Amino acid sequence: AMITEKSAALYARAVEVMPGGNSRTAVYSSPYPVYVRSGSGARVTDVDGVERIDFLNNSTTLIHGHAHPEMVEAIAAAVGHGTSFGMPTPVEVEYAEALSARNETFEHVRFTSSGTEAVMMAVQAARAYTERPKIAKIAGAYHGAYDAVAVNNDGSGNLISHAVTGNPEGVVANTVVIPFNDPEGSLEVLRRHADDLACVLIDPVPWRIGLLPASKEWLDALREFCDASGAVLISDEVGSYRVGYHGAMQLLGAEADITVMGKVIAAGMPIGAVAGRRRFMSVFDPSKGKPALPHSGSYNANPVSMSSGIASLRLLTPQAHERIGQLGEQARGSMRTALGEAGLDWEVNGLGSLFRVVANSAPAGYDSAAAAMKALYWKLLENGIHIGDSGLGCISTPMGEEEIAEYAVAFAKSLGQVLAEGRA
Amino acid sequence: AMITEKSAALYARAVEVMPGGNSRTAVYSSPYPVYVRSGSGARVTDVDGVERIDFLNNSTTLIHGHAHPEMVEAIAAAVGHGTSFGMPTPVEVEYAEALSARNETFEHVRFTSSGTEAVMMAVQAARAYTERPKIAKIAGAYHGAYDAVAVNNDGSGNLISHAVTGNPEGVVANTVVIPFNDPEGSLEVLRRHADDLACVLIDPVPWRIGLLPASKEWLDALREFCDASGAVLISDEVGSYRVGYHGAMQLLGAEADITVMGKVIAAGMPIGAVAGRRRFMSVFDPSKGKPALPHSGSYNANPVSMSSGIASLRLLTPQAHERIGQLGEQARGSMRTALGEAGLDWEVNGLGSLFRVVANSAPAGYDSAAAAMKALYWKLLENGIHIGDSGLGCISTPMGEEEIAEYAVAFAKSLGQVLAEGRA
Ligand SMILES: Cc1ncc(COP(=O)(O)O)c(CN)c1O
Ligand SMILES: Cc1ncc(COP(=O)(O)O)c(CN)c1O
């Protein structure tokens, strides 16, 4: 049924000018991905003219969906006045005030052009503040391509160092890994390295290891360890911030020293942020002599990304946050009903407006649970829905109960087709 | 004479929500920087309502100046269709075709959200391709905040390792440094490390060590060393690309394996690119199983930055490139005349549309040549001109003979005022 000839023709062009026709690993699918030309509200139109409901929203960036009129007005007005300057602007100050106001711990903020850069600068800040070399991160959790965090970042629960091809021992030896939600297992590792630990980098709701939240007991163990050792507690909320109105740590009853943000804070334009207590952020301050940690960047605090940010935070009201959490609960419940009626043991995890289908047992005719989840991703595309090819999804503010009901009908139909094709 | 009350008031707000009221080290000035609200063509209007001619153009990013109508149209129209997607778009293919066409060695390209990220991914690509740990870079050259390149990066010619506070030995020991334009001094270092060198990272026209071009002899020595050792030759042209129509290495008679680009290639929207021969770029290819080097990023190849890129490259015609080169030659000549008439030993370096005033001997009443250059930066601001506080500047395509003549008058007046204040 599905016509993808214009996607295939773009892919044939792309392979001549990009490696494997790709510029972003996460958006590649075999034999080629679907190419898209426009979005409006909750819906994306592909290059073959097919409109689908988007349930992943640029990897959970687009909390307000596609081309929200209030976002478009603010961004286009900023573009007209100049895209970037070699001087600070009023909107950087306005946006830092707006972001600082979201959480007590966001005393001072610094803007980058991505979450990948913001994670990197939060780790550099902790190393400059402590003058210690090691970082600790969660086994399996993903934090972007920066080489200190591109270690054990693939969903595995093993603690043995495993890094990207070429990441030197010089980097990999200074990143230690802790088991998620295992307080005693975590403290064993952290106590072994306490004298040398600059930071403990967590994600309170890491999607790559199943989108389960950090427990109170595990957050308490790490917060007490950081207070005792002097290690900086960094919460990477680039993806998970959206689960709470004041971010993920606040929802779970905890406080970070530094929080990394991105994605929803600007809801589509390039952004990252490092926010935390004044003392940890003081490594960046250039006002009293050379800073401990220089941090430049051509697009830092550019007024287009600041204007996108002001508009996003204005639209992300407590009422919007509540209503998308209602829709997330409706979506997760409809998926669990559909998986149980189909006779699969797969789980659906998530908080607020985030979810992830976590494939467990591979059904007949699939080599792995991940292959069965890729097949479900393709069947959902045929049935008018975009989700992540390993089960991630989210709600956008343009959605109502009708979109989630349409998704539930597509989800049940798709499961049926995946299972029937595996048995053929 | 100069009124900065609205800038002071923004700074007073900024210090409460950013470290030292700053989000980008390079745009800070004591006691506070000038804040700006808008740009049009070659001119910037500050928050106190004062219009000046911009001769630095967001650190040489804005090759087409501020809010170029054709740039504004392309960007604002792209925004209306969707700022970013979790799927590739037609404009990524169109822009990769446009950029690949600029140099024979740009066979395969990948997009990032910054030059800092692009440098990082080019170093990771060479380490993945060779499976060797070390990189070599130029003593003094700046490549952004990534910790492997944030070593010997502040204008010094010393080869002794000097890194940011907290950069661990595990990083710093794998970055070796070579003296710019010294073939035998460079080959001594590179031969000592040849078995362990993944790459030689250069900038062919590094502004931080005085904006002098790489010699034919030095580029030939490095190209031959890389061919012999299997090290990847990386040219970081994030700033220097603009000196030639086919980039900096081509102008100077050389070929890189990988070229890093940014800034002018999108002329004001967040961008970076890694462009090189197919074999080096193959580490990123996801089309034949898992790639050696995963490379994602929420804003990679976003259609707003791609649309900015297509418009910028379309506007950067051979005719435009020649005209800004002529204006740069006229500007450099007018500065050298003014410095000679004022009795300073200062030099003016640069190629094409780039220049740098290189302060040598401190005149009476200044502790250092750099303090004297900072004073000239402030006097130029008073006389209606923005340049860099250490002498960097550039020409933009909106400029004509009238802007370059106005600059020459302001430059001579400002030098007189700097010298008179130092002697007073
Ligand atoms: C937890 C986390 N941290 C950082 C990043 C990287 O952010 P960006 O895509 O803005 O570079 C991501 C992206 N998946 C993320 O999930
Ligand atoms: C040579 C060079 N490389 C890379 C960068 C970083 O690029 P961006 O500002 O886009 O991160 C810079 C910026 N100063 C640079 O000058």
Numbering used by the authors:
A (entry chain A), B (entry chain B): 0 to 423
Question: Anything the authors wrote about it?
Answer:
As part of investigations into the C-nucleoside formycin A (8-aza-9-deazaadenosine) biosynthetic gene cluster from Streptomyces kaniharaensis, we have characterised a pyridoxal 5′-phosphate (PLP) dependent aminotransferase (ForI) that aminates a pathway intermediate. ForI is a PLP-dependent enzyme from the biosynthetic pathway of the C-nucleoside antibiotic formycin. ForI possesses the mixed β-sheet and three-stranded antiparallel β-sheet insertion characteristic of the PLP dependent aspartic aminotransferase family. The predicted active site of ForI comprises residues from two monomers, indicating the dimer to be the functional unit.
Incubating ForI with l-Glu shows a rapid change in the UV-vis spectrum (ESI†). We incubated crystals of ForI with l-Glu for 20 minutes and collected a 1.56 Å resolution data set. The electron density clearly indicates that the pyridoxal co-factor is unattached to the enzyme, suggesting it to be PMP. Despite numerous attempts we have not observed density for l-Glu or α-KG. PMP forms a 3.2 Å hydrogen bonding interaction with ε-N of Lys 262. The plane of the PMP molecule has rotated by 22° relative to PLP. Residues Tyr 141 and Trp 206 are slightly displaced, Arg 207 switches to an alternate conformation. Accompanying these changes in protein structure are shifts in water molecule locations. These structural changes result in the pocket adjacent to the cofactor (bounded by Ala 25, Thr 60, Tyr 141, Trp 206) enlarging further and becoming more open to solvent.
